[PDB]
């Protein structure tokens, strides 16, 4: 049997899946995850897949740093994963502009506050619920020159020219971050 | 889409890309600018990956660029919510929920056991002392 | 014990004190009223085999109270594979001449089933190690029973996280590391034979024995303990055996 390798974290809005290699040949896998001072908890028992969903485990405390390891079966052979801190590393999903109503010389662009995998009291918390002040949305607009706006909420109140039409696009952003600070651009919407 | 002579009319995002499927060229004729066209085209032409209905067991799919995300029901997990949290009552999974000893059983369910000096309670998972001073317990704290 | 704290009297009830000719020798763990588990190397230089004593209910080596109980060690069983001066198979099963009285201050630690220990206890992060050993490397020993909580490591990580020392003891499948590599906390020589107890769902089990290590609390090193789970069968078969004529007995292993 060979030890897993290239263990990688695939996380978006906290949906966290651990992937690895190689495509199992006469060997199955068992994953274990934990916090630095916590006990080891096993997942994806004797799976033949080369992936393991660890979402329900990490959303228990997104600000904890987790370590995982993939055991190989024909102490067993294993390989550790890179440390993973959800809050600081989960990718921000592509946003969606929920709407925009013009009012004379100004337009209100509303960003739909998408849901995450973080459960709480039998519900899914929004990206805003989780990051609060750490999250901002930036607007990239123009008259259908480049323009931009930023909000600490999920809405943009900008100036425009009636008679003239504008197109919009938004991005989720966590300023404090270093990597994965921005999400992909939202689809384009025009007045 | 293009029909006879419609191209004589000026570009329109609504009539061409919303009320119809528009090609890149048609999109480029409405946005003009290269960047604006591409920023619009990445999403417009990405295609909803939630079409296959990948999320199993009553889960909800959320579309993303060339991918999706499944939101599962409490009793489920997995990339596609294919994992039954109720089909994992094996010993390697948190000691099968047994307080002390766990014994797997092919087909049927696992059975719990206890160390000498203890007995298995009716819940089939807990153990209680059968002697005054069972091993592993600290008297002045009990 | 290095970097630990005093174990409140009564909270380390299975801890044993081994003396040879009245002098402190090693630590040990009671697992029933008649048997004690300690380390094999603790007997490398024993000459007066009829002078081994096991004390239970101990706490403060400077004050006597009625919780203390002494028993001659009637038998010291060591694996035939153990080699004096070395580290592999560092375990010893001792038969007390007479059973001790179980009390609030004298209670045995549970000897777990092999698979339960390998499959569950082994993955419980922290466990307790204790004894009256040194408080510092080459330092003096403790008057009051000390205890320390240490994290366990799979051998692969131990090896990877430790600095290599040419021509030094190998970490076998009969051992396991636990502790810290920053030079702050670890067990020590005088703690040998003492228990490495794991707490799991309300009960404490024996998972290790203080065995060896590079100095005590040395930077880049972890403490090493005998992996008790590899001896469960060995221990249970011997506890059902008939006492041998002399004190010392070497039993085959497996
Ligand atoms: C650095 C010397 S040391 O500090 O005494 N460490 C040695 C091992 C130790 C570490 N590096 C070494 C290099 C050569 C050597 O002896 C020769 C040698 C070479 C190759 C294989 C073996 C073998 O054991 O198989 C032995 C021993 C050691 C060591 O620990 N030796 C044993 C006794 C061996 C006996 N049967 O007499 C010992 O002192 N045990 C008590 C103890 C308890 C707890 C700790 C702790 N938690 N921290 C540390 C020590
Ligand atoms: C639905 O479409 C997505 C596209 O990525 C695919 O991954 C699923 O397997 C399919 O059911
Ligand atoms: C989408 O989310 C999942 C978890 C279920 O609650 C569905 O009913 C809902 O539409
Ligand atoms: Ca057209
Ligand atoms: Ca048309
Ligand atoms: Ca056109
Ligand atoms: Ca039409
Ligand atoms: Ca229309
Ligand atoms: Ca053209
Ligand atoms: Ca055209
Ligand atoms: Ca898509
Ligand atoms: Ca005393």
A116 forms bridges with which residues in the sheet?
none
User: How was this entry determined?
Assistant: X-ray
Chain C closest CA to A95's CA: distance in Å?
Answer: 40
Of A51, A119, A167, the CB nearest to B36: A167
Closest partner CB to B69 (pick from A13, A42, A187):
A13
Chain A, chain C: beta-carbon pairs less than 8 Å apart: 19
Ligand 3 is surrounded, with C-beta below 6 A, by B 58-60, 71-73
Report the alpha-carbon distance of residue B49 to residue B43 in Å, rounded.
12
CA dist list (Å): C148 to C187, C202, C214, C223: 8, 19, 18, 12
How many other CB atoms are there within 10 angstroms of residue C49's CB atom? 14
User: Encoding tokens for residue B94?
Assistant: 């948190």
Under 8 Å between Cβ of C156 and C213: no
Distance, CA of A187 to chain centre: 17
Asked whether the bond before C254 is cis by omega within 30 degrees of 0, the reply is yes
DSSP at C144: B
Separation of alpha carbons C249 and C75, rounded Å: 7
Tell me the C-alpha to C-alpha distance, in Å, between residue B11 and each of B7, B17, B28, B74, C77.
Answer: 8, 10, 9, 48, 94
Asked if B115 has any chain A CB less than 8 Å from its own CB, the reply is: no
C159-190 exposure pattern, b = at least 16 Cβ within 10 A, e = fewer: eeebeeeeeeeebeebbbbbbbbebebbbbbb
User: Radius of gyration of chain C from Cα atoms?
Assistant: 17
**Ligand lying closest to the C-alpha of residue C83:** 1
E strands along chain C, which residues? Answer: 5-6, 15-20, 23-30, 35-38, 52-56, 69-79, 92-96, 126-131, 146-153, 175-178, 195-200, 203-212, 223-227, 248-251
Read off the tokens for C158.
Answer: 């131990």
**Residue keyed to tokens 């662009």:** A109
> What are the structural domain ranges in chain C?
1-12+109-229, 13-108+230-243
C-alpha dihedral over C245, C246, C247, C249, to 10 degrees?
-90
Distance from CA of C6 to the nearest CA of B (A): 16
* Minimal CA separation from C157 to chain A, in Å: 9
Cβ proximity of C60 and C48 under 8 Å: no
C214 lines ligand 1 (CB under 6 A): yes
Residue of A nearest to B65 (CA): A94
**DSSP tag of C245:** S
CB contact under 8 A, C154 and A32: no
Instruction: Indicate yes or no: CB of B140 within 8 angstroms of CB of C116.
Output: no
Helix axes B34-44, B24-31, angle to 10 degrees: 130
* CA nearest to C104 within chain B: B139
Q: What are phi and psi of C250, to 5 degrees?
A: -105, 115
Fold match between domain A1-89 and domain A90-191: yes
Got the DSSP string for C145-196?
A: -EEEEEEEE-HHHHHHHS---SS-----TTEEEES-SSSS-B--GGGTT-EE
How many CB atoms are closer than 10 A to CB C88? 20
How far away is chain B from the Cα of C215, in angstroms, using its nearest Cα? 30
Q: Check if the beta carbon of residue C166 is closer than 8 Å to that of residue C160.
A: no
Please give the Cα distance from C49 to C71 (Å, whole number): 14
* Contact of A105 with A159, CB cutoff 8 Å: yes
Q: Where are the domains of chain A?
A: 1-89, 90-191
Query: Measured between beta carbons, which residues in chain A are less than 8 angstroms from residue C125?
Result: 34, 37-40
Kindly report the backbone phi and psi dihedral angles of residue A52, in degrees, each rounded to the nearest multiple of 5, phi listed first: -150, 120
Q: Residue A102 Cα, ligand 6 centroid: separation in angstroms?
A: 27
Interface contact flag, B78 A53, Cβ < 8 Å: yes
Burial readout A33-45 (b: 16 or more C-beta within 10 A, e: otherwise): bbbeeeebbbbbe
Cα(C129) to ligand 3 centroid in Å equals 49
| DSSP state for residue C85 in the 8-state scheme | T
Yes or no: is domain A1-89 CATH 3.40.50.300?
A: no
SS3 content of chain C, % helix, strand, coil (to 5): 15, 35, 50
Of B30, B69, B92, the CB nearest to A42: B92
In CATH, C1-12+109-229 is 3.30.470.10: no
The length of chain A, given as a count of residues: 191
Nearest CA in chain B to A10: B79
Q: Is B56 in the pocket of ligand 2 (CB under 6 A)?
A: no
**Distance (Å, whole) CA C63 – CA B48:** 78
Is the CB of A124 less than 8 angstroms away from the CB of B65? Answer: no
Tell me the β-bridge partners of B6: none
Q: Alpha-carbon distance C25 to C31, whole Å?
A: 19
CA dihedral A29, A35, A38, A42 (to 10 degrees): -20
Give the whole-angstrom CA distance, residue C197 versus residue C191.
Answer: 14
Does residue B78 belong to the interface with chain A, where contact is any CB pair within 8 Å?
yes
Residue A77, strand partner residues: A72
Does C41 qualify as catalytic in the annotation? yes
Does ligand 1 have an atom closer than 6 angstroms to the CB of C86? yes
C45 conformational bin, left if phi > 0, alpha if psi -120 to 50, beta if neither: alpha
Residues of A with CB under 8 A from a CB of B: 12-13, 15, 17, 30, 41-42, 45, 51, 53, 55-56, 93-94, 114-115, 117, 119, 122, 124, 140, 142, 144, 167, 169, 184-188, 190
Cβ of B54 closer than 6 Å to ligand 2, yes or no, is: yes
Quoted resolution (Å): 2.5
Six-digit token string for A6 = 């290239």
Tokens 């995982």 — which residue? A68
The 3-class secondary structure across chain B, one letter per residue, is: CCCCCHHHCCCCHHHHHHCCCCCHHHHHHHHCCHHHHHHHHHHHCCCCHHHHCCCCCCCEEEEECCEEEEECCCCEECCCCCEECCCCCCCCCHHHHCCCEEECCCCCCCEEECCCCEEECCCCCCEEECCCCCCCCCHHHC
* A90-191: CATH topology: Immunoglobulin-like (2.60.40)
DSSP code per residue over A25-79: SS-EEEEEEEETTSPPEEEEEEE-SSEEE-HHHHTT-TTS-EEEEEEEE---EEE
| Residue C137 annotated among the catalytic residues of the structure | no
Q: Tell me the CA distances in angstroms from A37 to A177, C125, C126, one per residue in order.
A: 25, 7, 8
Q: Is B44 exposed, middle or buried (0-12, 13-18, 19+ CB in 10 A)?
A: middle
What is the number of alpha carbons within 13 Å of residue C68 lying toward its C-beta?
Answer: 14
Q: Under DSSP, is residue C63 helix (H, G, I), strand (E, B) or coil?
A: coil
Please name which of A175, A112, A107 lies closest in space to residue A141, comparing C-alpha atoms.
A107
Q: Is the CB of B49 under 6 A from ligand 2?
A: yes
- For the domain C13-108+230-243, what is the CATH code? 2.40.10.10
Residue C80 appears among annotated catalytic residues = no
Residue A8, classed as helix, strand or coil, is: strand
Q: Among A166, A184, C18, which residue's Cα sits nearest to residue B36?
A: A166
The token pair that represents C32 in the structure block: 């029933």
What radius of gyration do chain B's Cα atoms show?
A: 31
């Amino acid at each position: 049997t060979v030890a897993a390798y290239n263990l990688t974290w695939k996380s978006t809005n906290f949906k966290t899946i651990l992937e690895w290699e190689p495509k199992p040949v006469n060997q199955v896998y068992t994953v274990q995850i934990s916090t630095k001072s916590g006990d080891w908890k096993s997942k994806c028992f004797y799976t033949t897949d080369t992936e393991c969903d660890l979402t329900d485990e990490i959303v228990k405390d997104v600000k904890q740093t987790y370590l995982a390891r993939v055991f190989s079966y024909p102490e067993p052979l294993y390989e550790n994963s890179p440390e993973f801190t959800p809050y600081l590393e989960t990718n921000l999903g592509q946003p969606t502009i929920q709407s925009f109503e013009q009012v004379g010389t100004k337009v209100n662009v509303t960003v739909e506050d998408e849901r995450t995998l973080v459960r709480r009291n039998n519900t899914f918390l929004s990206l805003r619920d989780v990051f609060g002040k750490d999250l901002i949305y930036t607007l990239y607009y123009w008259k259908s020159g480049k323009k931009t706006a930023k909000t600490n909420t999920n809405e943009f109140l900008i100036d425009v020219d009636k008679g003239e039409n504008y197109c919009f696009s938004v991005q989720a952003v966590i300023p404090s971050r270093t990597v994965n600070r921005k999400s992909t651009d939202s689809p384009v919407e025009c007045m | 889409a293009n029909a006879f002579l419609e191209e004589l009319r000026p570009g329109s995002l609504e009539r061409e890309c919303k009320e119809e499927q528009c090609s890149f060229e048609e999109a480029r004729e409405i946005f003009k600018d290269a960047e604006r066209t591409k920023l619009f085209w990445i999403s417009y032409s990405d295609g909803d990956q939630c079409a296959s209905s990948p999320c199993q067991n009553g889960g909800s799919c959320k579309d993303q660029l060339q991918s999706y995300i499944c939101f599962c029901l409490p009793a489920f997990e997995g990339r596609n919510c294919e994992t039954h949290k109720d089909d994992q009552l094996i010993c390697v999974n948190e000691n099968g929920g047994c307080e002390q000893y766990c014994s797997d059983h092919t087909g049927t369910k696992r059975s719990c056991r206890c160390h000498e000096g203890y007995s298995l309670l009716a819940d089939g998972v807990s153990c209680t002392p059968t002697v005054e001073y069972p091993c592993g317990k600290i008297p002045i704290l009990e | 014990i290095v970097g630990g704290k005093v174990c409140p009297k009564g909270e380390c009830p299975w801890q044993v004190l081994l003396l040879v000719n009245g002098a402190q020798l090693c630590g040990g763990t009671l697992i029933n009223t008649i048997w004690v588990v300690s380390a094999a190397h603790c007997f490398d230089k024993i000459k007066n085999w009829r002078n081994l004593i096991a004390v239970l209910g101990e706490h403060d080596l400077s004050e006597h109270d009625g919780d203390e109980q002494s028993r001659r060690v009637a038998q010291v069983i060591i694996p035939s594979t153990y080699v004096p001066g070395t580290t592999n198979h560092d375990i010893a099963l001792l038969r007390l001449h007479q059973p001790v009285v179980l009390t609030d201050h004298v209670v045995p630690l549970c000897l777990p089933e092999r698979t339960f220990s390998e499959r569950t206890l082994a993955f419980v992060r922290f466990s307790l190690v204790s004894g009256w050993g040194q408080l510092l490397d080459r330092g003096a020993t403790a008057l009051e029973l000390m205890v320390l909580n240490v994290p366990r490591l799979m051998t692969q990580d131990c090896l990877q996280q430790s600095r290599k020392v040419g021509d030094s003891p190998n970490i076998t499948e009969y051992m396991f590391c636990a502790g810290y590599s920053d030079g702050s906390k670890d067990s020590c020589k005088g703690d040998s034979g003492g228990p490495h107890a794991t707490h799991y769902r309300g009960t404490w089990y024996l998972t290790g024995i203080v065995s060896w290590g590079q100095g005590c609390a040395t930077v880049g090193h972890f403490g090493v303990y005998t992996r008790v789970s590899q001896y469960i069968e060995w221990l249970q078969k011997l506890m059902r055996s008939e006492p041998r004529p002399g004190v010392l007995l070497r039993a085959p292993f497996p």
